[PDB]
Design a protein around this ligand. Structure first.
Ligand code: CLA
Ligand code: CLA
Ligand code: CLA
Ligand code: CLA
Ligand SMILES: CC(C)=CCC/C(C)=C/CC/C(C)=C/CC/C(C)=C/CC/C(C)=C/CC/C(C)=C/CC/C(C)=C/CC/C(C)=C/CC/C(C)=C/CC1=CC(=O)C(C)=C(C)C1=O
Ligand SMILES: CCCCCCCCCCCCCCCCCC(=O)OC[C@H](CO[C@@H]1O[C@H](CO)[C@H](O)[C@H](O)[C@H]1O)OC(=O)CCCCCCCCCCCCCCCCC
Ligand SMILES: CCCCCCCCCCCCCCCC(=O)OC[C@H](CO[C@@H]1O[C@H](CS(=O)(=O)O)[C@@H](O)[C@H](O)[C@H]1O)OC(=O)CCCCCCCCCCCCCCC
Ligand SMILES: CCCCCCCCCCCCCCCC(=O)OC[C@H](CO[C@@H]1O[C@H](CS(=O)(=O)O)[C@@H](O)[C@H](O)[C@H]1O)OC(=O)CCCCCCCCCCCCCCC
Ligand code: HEC
Ligand SMILES: CCCCCCCCCCCCO[C@@H]1O[C@H](CO)[C@@H](O[C@H]2O[C@H](CO)[C@@H](O)[C@H](O)[C@H]2O)[C@H](O)[C@H]1O
Ligand SMILES: CCCCCCCS[C@@H]1O[C@H](CO)[C@@H](O)[C@H](O)[C@H]1O
Ligand SMILES: CCCCCCCS[C@@H]1O[C@H](CO)[C@@H](O)[C@H](O)[C@H]1O
Ligand SMILES: CCCCCCCS[C@@H]1O[C@H](CO)[C@@H](O)[C@H](O)[C@H]1O
Ligand code: OEX
Ligand SMILES: [Ca+2]
Ligand SMILES: [Ca+2]
Ligand SMILES: [Cl-]
Ligand SMILES: [Cl-]
Lengths: 34, 50, 51, 35, 97, 30, 137, 51, 243, 334, 34
């Protein structure tokens, strides 16, 4: 299939960037003095 | 093959207000041998980066 | 090409250039958009990774 | 090109003059011990 | 089919003998008596329709003519090739040792 | 796309220089 | 392999007469060739005119023939172009232009023979390297 | 007729003919325009002009 | 009187000599005397290149270009026979001289156009009945434009005509057909045309000066691409002498 | 005080986050100019006729290079050593074709880096320090001067200066080998000893100090926490380190004096690299590596090749191919 | 230039995956009790 050659990078960054934002926030919440 | 056939988005805004020339010598109306001075498309870009 | 003889020097030279690689083969270079530059096999890749 | 040259000449002269007068402005004294 | 004209020329008599119309001048060192004096005249007076025309160069000594006669069998003529005669290349073709 | 990538990495490195100098962990005596 | 009397036996003249050079003469020929000639003819080529080399086969086809002691000694007194047609003493070192090529001023007849003997002997030792240029280094 | 005037009278330049995920320049679809072919006049066997 | 050290680094060495405004004279030609041009000089002042439009039906124009190889463009010390023909026209037959200069000019947008600016093997003739060369004499003629690179020139991958590889050796198993035009070097030889318009004559010294316009093809990179059409304009100077 | 006096006080302030100083007054603008011109040329400059034969070489990213192949290309051989500022050109287009950016960058960079060296002296004096860190930096600086200025002067052209690029650098190295036999030059050999020995003594010192750090932390913490910035006590046991190293080799081969040890650490690479720099700077005037080509000859006079002759054959390959359209006469004399 | 089409995504992830690993670890260190 002749897919758009930027579809892979677009999907990967679409997933990675916001997911990493949430992981950063979650882990630094867990490490806060409980 | 004008700008709007080529997916240009900012180039027309530069042209709308009078930036029509490149330091490389061409104008968007198709002229050769122009001296746009500093305020070519490149000068506008550089000014925004600075 | 069995039974064929070529005498045109550019053609003879072309085949001579392939003969430096040993036996001469016809390849499909289109299906994979092949670039004409040699790669190693899994024998080479395995040996590199493991060493 | 003429304007550019004159500009650069001025710029360079300006900075060289800072360096020379600067080092003339009691440089040995500008240290933490004996002045 | 695009063709390298210098390679094609190697398949003619140019590939076998001194081509009075094309060969660089250092090639005249291969035979007794030709260089530099006759070599200079021969290149200066090219092209020639046949090898014998080389004897028609003006001002030749009788000894000079006999040396040519003795060497005609080592000469040939082929059509002038622009790629071999431009750039002063008959006098210096960028090859030394 | 490659020019963009190379210049992007370079620009990140110059930004990194800026934070590493002016927003370093300040050295504190003892 | 050795530098034998046979290796040192070279043509004296155009008529097939030979001369066997001594080892002292061989040494002397190398020394004097380095002294007066090698700045242009190192390894049997010619730096200022690469079309002409010092190979024996090239010397044989020179006019007069230079592939013998006599022809080489005469070349060093009165050098000519390859066809024998012009005398080039004014631009090539010779005994006759020792005024403008001062290194020729104290070369004796004996020295010229030694240098000529070096030119004929070296290719018997070095083969195609003599007069070969960088390809054969 | 100027080529530029003819080119406006072509639907591949109409901005209501695209798609949300058909990305990039217009030239990526129909191509980089090179030349007007000229005005086509259609006629039937009777010679009547048809549109 | 100017010496090398007066001139060096000024740009004047690339300028042809000029004649005074008083030089509006007439130089007699004796049809029984033989003559030569002892020195022809051509100083280009404008290089124009014909654009190559996307369609026929509009003729392309010659457009201005920017010189990027500095003051290295003039033809000079050119000489040859000036024949008096049996209708009184003169024909100049170029023999030798600094009769070419490689030149690179740049189109708007940056495309570089190298060419061999030249009058090699020039044969140029006047109108009939030139009893004197005057401000009304013109020369028109043709010349040869050999390949801008000569046959030893090797491209960046080592390929050439009289030397070099004959294939793309970095792509050992690529099909050769698509690369034929880049692999097989070709040496062009095409014709150019020039006109010289006399504007000044010193009847007493044999000197003339004027304007020229030539047309020729640019570099085709040994057959790798199509050449452009170039139009060169400038001033010329020539000294004519009995010989 | 007056404006000038306050200005001087600011320029020379020990309190600025980055020290300025009088050397800095020259260094700042010249380094900024070289950096900006370099970045813009490396991205966007068109091809440059390095060898003056109308054969332009593409250095920049937008014209088909990557980080490894890209360069700012040296100025044209037609220029030679002539000074080619922007205002000497008819246009920026000509300036670009002829490799103007290279001259602009390297002249500003050399001036700026020489001022960096002065500035190091300057601050050391403001801080009541001993003054010779700037002498250590003279070694890399000398080396930059050798490849960007001395070598071009010797050879008569900035087109033979080192290109500002990764592959260009290797081009310069390989051509330098063909032309000077640098590997066979003892000053380059001392440079190798300087940099290989500098690496060696760097690893040695790192490992000896690290090996004798005093226990100040638990197994969960990085031992680096066992040192506090500005503490008075030394953080490792030098007597322990010397005890180890003196036994590895022999007692008197090891330093127990930290001052002598650190002097050696400075001196070895700095001296070796000064000889590296002087190697390039004297091969600039064609005093070249040892030549033992055909040095070994048998009883008849046959040449008996040595590894030197095999080097020679590799050198010949470089020589005959380099700048393949630029030589018309049989000797490459510069 | 005919580059490898996977160059972009290989480069992107090469930077992003370990950079984000480090950022996650840095931020949760800062958020630990002063
Ligand atoms: C006002 C914004 C705007 C507009 C109108 C344009 C317009 C244009 N650009 Mg420019 N551009 C922009 C901003 C813009 N750009 C920005 C910010 C960048 C940096 C990323 C660019 C970088 C850029 C490049 C690199 C290129 C263009 C090109 C173009 C042309 C083709 C556009 C196209 O294919 O879109 C396609 C648009 C889409 C497929 C729509 C995306 C819809 C998103 C993905 C929806 C996401 C939904 C969301 C996740 C839902 C969340 C739900 C939740 C709340 C519950 C067109 C002239 C192309 C061109 O021809 O250049 C010459 C080209 O190559 N642009
Ligand atoms: C510290 C500031 C500084 C210095 C030292 C330089 C230096 C230089 N520039 Mg750069 N430049 C600068 C800032 C500077 N620039 C800035 C801020 C810009 C942006 C506008 C530029 C833009 C620029 C361009 C566009 C170009 C240069 C070029 C040059 C070179 C030619 C300069 C010249 O011809 O001056 C001549 C002027 C003098 C000789 C004046 C000196 C007079 C003093 C008063 C006498 C004493 C000086 C004497 C030599 C000894 C010094 C004292 C010492 C012993 C302590 C030179 C490497 C050119 C280039 O690099 O060419 C390849 C070039 O094209 N510069
Ligand atoms: C077993 C491998 C080996 C050895 C023993 C050497 C040894 C040497 N190399 Mg080579 N080298 C090697 C592998 C080696 N090399 C490899 C794999 C490469 C890459 C292909 C190189 C590339 C290389 C280059 C390009 C050069 C050398 C040079 C040298 C010399 C200086 C090295 C130096 O200062 O290092 C740093 C180390 C120290 C400063 C520690 C001291 C090392 C010395 C030599 C040991 C002395 C011990 C002593 C003799 C033993 C007796 C002691 C007794 C009293 C108890 C030295 C002769 C240079 C040379 O040829 O100079 C003539 C040179 O230019 N090397
Ligand atoms: C193992 C094999 C080997 C080894 C170990 C070496 C080792 C060396 N070679 Mg030799 N070389 C080799 C093989 C080898 N070579 C071969 C095979 C060839 C032939 C192909 C050569 C041909 C050769 C040449 C032609 C040269 C060398 C040079 C060198 C030295 C390079 C390091 C240097 O110059 O430091 C000196 C330090 C510098 C040059 C750094 C200057 C830094 C400036 C002052 C500041 C720059 C700041 C920067 C732009 C921005 C920084 C970041 C910013 C954010 C602040 C070093 C001794 C070079 C040398 O001797 O130079 C003098 C040299 O020119 N080699
Ligand atoms: C089967 C059989 C027969 C078995 C028998 C075996 C047996 C029992 C044998 C016994 C008999 C016997 C011993 C025989 C000997 C055989 C023999 C001669 C073997 C050869 C050994 C050999 C080739 C050795 C190589 C020589 C060698 C190691 C040379 C070293 C050269 C060298 C550069 C030394 C360094 C000197 C120096 C100036 C060092 C300073 C640089 C440095 C390390 C800085 C870092 C540093 C240093 C400090 O100093 C401290 C403090 C700190 C902090 C620190 O940073
Ligand atoms: C850090 C963050 C980095 C990005 C994170 C994730 C990236 C996801 C981006 C999604 C991109 C969309 C898919 C496009 C794939 C592609 O190839 O495009 C690529 C296109 C370029 O298009 C390319 O053009 C080329 C010639 O230049 C060629 O023709 C290619 O074939 C063509 O694909 O990129 C863009 O157009 C970017 C700008 C788009 C402007 C959109 C305007 C609409 C805005 C609506 C937003 C509101 C809607 C949401 C509301 C809720
Ligand atoms: C394309 C062309 C366009 C290019 C334009 C570039 C020029 C832009 C200049 C704009 C001014 C803003 C800059 C401030 C940054 C700064 O340093 O602040 C940090 C401190 C605080 O400033 C301090 O300022 C303080 C006041 S306050 O804190 O800011 O209020 C004061 O207390 C103190 O004395 C003073 O030192 O400034 C200083 O340390 C003193 C000046 C240091 C000089 C920095 C420049 C050195 C450049 C090095 C060159 C290397 C080349 C590049 C390598 C990648
Ligand atoms: C053949 C005929 C002879 C002719 C001679 C030829 C002339 C050339 C010889 C030059 C003389 C050198 C003497 C220098 C002594 C010295 O440096 O004193 C400074 C200190 C003092 O030593 C320290 O001495 C101290 C006491 S005191 O300072 O000396 O008072 C003591 O505290 C300490 O432990 C001790 O290490 O010496 C040291 O620190 C030890 C290392 C010395 C060796 C390196 C320095 C030289 C450069 C490195 C070599 C680079 C070469 C490699 C290139 C890649
Ligand atoms: C350079 C300055 C030279 C020096 C020193 C010597 N020779 Fe030479 N040689 C040189 C040239 C340019 C030529 C060709 C001259 C020409 O136009 O023909 C020569 C030629 C010779 C020859 C003839 C070669 C042949 O026939 O194949 C010989 C025998 C010769 N040279 C010998 C020779 C000797 C013995 C020298 C030292 C005393 C000497 N040459 C010095 C240039 C130079
Ligand atoms: C192109 C090169 C220019 C050539 C200039 C030739 C210089 C030779 C004449 C020197 C005259 C300058 O004289 C010198 O000037 C400076 C600047 O005003 C003075 O002034 C300085 O005094 C003190 C000294 O501690 C400084 O702290 C203070 O910042 C400054 O005002 C010096 O104390 C004075 O000695
Ligand atoms: C940081 C970039 C500084 C370079 C500025 C170059 C100015 S160039 C200058 O500009 C004038 C005003 O626009 C023009 O009228 C004039 O023709 C032009 O020569
Ligand atoms: C003048 C060239 C024609 C003669 C045939 C060439 C040798 S064989 C030739 O080699 C190619 C690689 O170059 C293969 O891709 C191809 O399949 C094969 O036909
Ligand atoms: C902010 C710095 C801008 C750098 C400007 C690059 C030169 S300007 C550039 O030149 C190209 C080649 O001539 C032209 O094809 C192009 O149209 C033009 O944008
Ligand atoms: O330029 Mn760069 O490199 Ca020093 O040598 Mn000569 O010149 Mn070129 O050949 Mn080899
Ligand atoms: Ca393909
Ligand atoms: Ca007229
Ligand atoms: Cl090269
Ligand atoms: Cl040359």
């Amino acid at each position: 299939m002749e897919v758009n050659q930027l579809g892979l990078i677009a999907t990967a960054l679409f997933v990675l960037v916001p997911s990493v934002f949430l992981i950063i926030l979650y882990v630094q919440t867990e490490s806060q003095q409980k | 093959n004008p700008m709007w056939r080529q997916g240009m988005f900012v180039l027309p805004f530069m042209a709308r207000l009078g930036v029509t020339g490149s330091w490389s010598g061409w104008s968007i109306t198709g002229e050769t041998g122009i001296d746009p001075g500093f305020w070519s498309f490149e000068g506008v870009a550089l000014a925004h980066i600075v | 090409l069995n039974g064929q003889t070529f005498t045109d020097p550019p053609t003879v030279k072309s085949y001579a250039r392939k003969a430096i690689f040993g036996e001469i083969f016809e390849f499909d270079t289109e299906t994979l958009n092949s670039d004409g530059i040699f790669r190693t096999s899994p024998r080479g890749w395995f040996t590199f990774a493991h060493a | 090109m003429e304007t550019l040259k004159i500009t650069v000449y001025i710029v360079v002269t300006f900075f060289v003059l800072l360096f020379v007068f600067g080092f003339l402005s009691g440089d040995p004294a500008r240290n933490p011990k004996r002045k | 089919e695009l063709v390298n004209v210098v390679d094609e020329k190697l398949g003619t008599a140019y590939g076998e003998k001194i081509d009075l119309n094309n060969t660089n001048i250092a090639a005249f060192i291969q035979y007794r008596g030709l260089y530099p004096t006759l070599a200079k005249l021969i290149v200066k007076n090219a092209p020639y329709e046949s090898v014998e025309d080389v004897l028609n160069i003006p001002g030749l000594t009788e000894r000079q003519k006999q040396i040519l006669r003795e060497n005609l069998e080592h000469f040939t003529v082929t059509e002038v090739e622009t790629a071999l005669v431009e750039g002063g290349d008959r006098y210096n073709n960028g090859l030394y040792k | 796309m490659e020019t963009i990538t190379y210049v992007f990495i370079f620009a990140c490195i110059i930004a990194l220089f800026f934070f590493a100098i002016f927003f370093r962990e300040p050295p504190r005596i003892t | 392999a050795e530098l034998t009397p046979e290796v040192l036996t070279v043509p004296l003249n155009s008529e097939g007469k030979t001369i066997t050079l001594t080892e002292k003469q061989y040494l002397e020929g190398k020394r004097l060739f380095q002294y007066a000639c090698a700045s242009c003819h190192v390894g049997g080529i010619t730096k200022t005119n690469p079309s002409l080399d010092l190979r024996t086969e090239t010397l044989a086809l020179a006019t007069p023939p230079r592939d013998n002691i006599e022809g080489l000694v005469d070349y060093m007194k009165n050098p000519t172009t390859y066809d024998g047609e012009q005398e080039i003493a004014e631009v090539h070192p010779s005994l006759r232009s020792a005024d403008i090529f001062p290194k020729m001023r104290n070369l004796t007849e004996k020295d010229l023979v030694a240098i000529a003997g070096h030119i004929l002997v070296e290719p018997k030792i070095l083969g195609d390297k003599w007069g070969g240029g960088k390809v054969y280094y | 007729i100027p080529e530029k005037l003819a080119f406006y009278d072509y639907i591949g330049n109409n901005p209501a003919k695209g798609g949300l995920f058909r990305t990039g320049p217009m030239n990526k679809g129909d191509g980089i325009a090179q030349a007007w072919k000229g005005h086509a006049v259609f006629r039937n066997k009777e010679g009547e002009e048809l549109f | 009187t100017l010496t090398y050290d007066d001139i060096v680094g000024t740009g004047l060495a690339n300028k042809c000599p000029t004649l005074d405004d008083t030089a509006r004279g007439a130089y007699p030609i004796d049809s029984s005397q033989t003559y030569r041009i002892a020195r022809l000089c051509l100083q280009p002042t404008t290089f124009l290149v014909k654009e190559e439009p996307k369609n026929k039906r509009q003729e392309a124009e010659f457009v201005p270009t920017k010189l990027v190889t500095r003051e290295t463009t003039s033809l000079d010390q050119i000489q040859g026979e000036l024949k008096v023909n049996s209708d009184g026209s003169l024909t100049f037959v170029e023999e030798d001289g600094i009769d070419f200069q490689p030149v690179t000019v740049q189109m708007a947008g940056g495309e570089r156009i190298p060419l061999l600016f030249t009058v090699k093997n020039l044969v140029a003739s006047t109108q009939p009945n030139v009893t004197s060369i005057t401000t009304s004499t013109d020369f028109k003629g043709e010349f040869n434009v050999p390949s801008y690179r000569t046959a030893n020139f090797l491209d960046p991958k080592g390929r050439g005509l009289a030397s070099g590889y004959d294939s793309a050796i970095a792509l050992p198993q690529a099909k050769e057909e698509e690369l034929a035009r880049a692999n097989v070097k070709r040496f062009s030889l095409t014709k150019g045309q020039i006109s010289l318009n006399v504007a000044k004559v010193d009847g007493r010294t044999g000197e003339i000066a004027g304007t020229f316009e030539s047309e020729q093809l640019s570099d085709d990179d040994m057959g790798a691409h199509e050449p452009h059409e170039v139009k060169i304009q400038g001033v010329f100077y020539a000294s004519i002498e009995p010989a | 005080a007056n404006l000038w006096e306050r200005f001087c006080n600011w320029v020379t302030s020990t309190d600025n986050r980055l020290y300025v100083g009088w050397f800095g007054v020259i260094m700042i603008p010249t380094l900024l100019a070289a950096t900006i011109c370099f970045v813009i040329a490396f991205i966007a400059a068109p091809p440059v006729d390095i060898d003056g034969i109308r054969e332009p070489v593409s250095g920049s990213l937008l014209y088909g290079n990557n980080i490894i192949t890209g360069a700012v290309v040296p100025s044209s051989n037609a220029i030679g050593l002539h000074f080619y500022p922007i205002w000497e050109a008819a246009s920026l287009d000509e300036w670009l074709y002829n490799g103007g950016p290279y001259q602009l960058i390297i002249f500003h960079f050399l001036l700026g880096a020489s001022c960096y060296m002065g500035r190091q002296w300057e601050l050391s004096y403001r801080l009541g320090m001993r003054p010779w860190i700037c002498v250590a930096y003279s070694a890399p600086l000398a080396s930059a001067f050798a490849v960007f200025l001395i070598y071009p002067i010797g050879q008569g052209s900035f087109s033979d200066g080192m290109p500002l690029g990764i592959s260009g650098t290797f081009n310069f190295m390989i051509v330098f080998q063909a032309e000077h036999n640098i590997l066979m030059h003892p000053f380059h050999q001392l440079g190798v000893a300087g940099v290989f020995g500098g690496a060696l003594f760097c690893a040695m010192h790192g490992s000896l100090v690290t090996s004798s750090l005093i226990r100040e932390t638990t197994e969960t913490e990085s031992a680096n926490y066992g040192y506090k910035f500005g503490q008075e006590e030394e953080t490792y046991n030098i007597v322990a380190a010397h005890g180890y190293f003196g036994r590895l080799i022999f007692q008197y081969a090891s330093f127990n004096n930290s001052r002598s040890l650190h002097f050696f650490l400075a001196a070895w690479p700095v001296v070796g690299v000064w000889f590296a720099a002087l190697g390039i700077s004297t091969m600039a005037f064609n005093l070249n590596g040892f030549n033992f080509n055909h040095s070994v000859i048998d009883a008849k006079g046959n040449v008996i090749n040595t590894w030197a002759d095999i080097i020679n054959r590799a050198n010949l390959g470089m020589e005959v191919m380099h700048e393949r359209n630029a030589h018309n006469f049989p000797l490459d004399l510069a």
